[PDB]
Amino acid sequence: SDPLAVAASIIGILHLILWILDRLFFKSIYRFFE
Amino acid sequence: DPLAVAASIIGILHLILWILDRLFFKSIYRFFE
Amino acid sequence: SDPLAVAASIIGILHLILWILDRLFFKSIYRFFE
Amino acid sequence: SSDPLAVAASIIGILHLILWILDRLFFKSIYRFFE
Numbered sequence: 001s002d003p004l005a006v007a008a009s010i011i012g013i014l015h016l017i018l019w020i021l022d023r024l025f026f027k028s029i030y031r032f033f034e
Numbered sequence: 035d036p037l038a039v040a041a042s043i044i045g046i047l048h049l050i051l052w053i054l055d056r057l058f059f060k061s062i063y064r065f066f067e
Numbered sequence: 068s069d070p071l072a073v074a075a076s077i078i079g080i081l082h083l084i085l086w087i088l089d090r091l092f093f094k095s096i097y098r099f100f101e
Numbered sequence: 102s103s104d105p106l107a108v109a110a111s112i113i114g115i116l117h118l119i120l121w122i123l124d125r126l127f128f129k130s131i132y133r134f135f136e
């Protein structure tokens with residue numbers, strides 16, 4: 001239970017979540033003008 | 035730790051999906067150049 | 068844990084922060100000109 | 102100080118930072134000649 005390890009884990013989870021949300025928005029936007 | 039394993043697998047899938055996304059968008063925005 | 072894990076944790080936190088600033092900049096540019 | 106999964110994820114995180122840095126660098130560059 002290193003603080004850096006736990007923070008890095010949570011940040012990786014949040015990073016992938018926000019990435020799929022951002023790219024979902026952008027892929028839905030680009031899925032209309034093509 | 036289960037948290038470390040979850041974060042590791044999420045990081046690997048994140049890199050893989052980001053690479054596929056980058057290939058998609060680089061081959062989609064490589065026609066303009 | 069080991070230097071590899073510590074550096075990887077610092078780097079993952081940096082990566083989240085950097086991608087946050089990148090997407091915030093792009094969303095602020097696409098939230099005023101669209 | 103050795104989990105194979107942890108070492109793999111660490112190397113992957115470093116390479117991910119490097120690749121995203123290069124991606125956004127050349128992206129910002131392309132978006133620097135167009136603005």
Ligand SMILES: N[C@H]1CCC2(CC1)[C@H]1C[C@@H]3C[C@@H](C[C@H]2C3)C1
Binds near residue numbers: 012072079110113
């Ligand atoms: N992309 C980051 C890189 C650092 C780790 C994943 C998230 C990796 C696996 C676990 C254990 C350490 C710290 C994080 C969680 C090394």
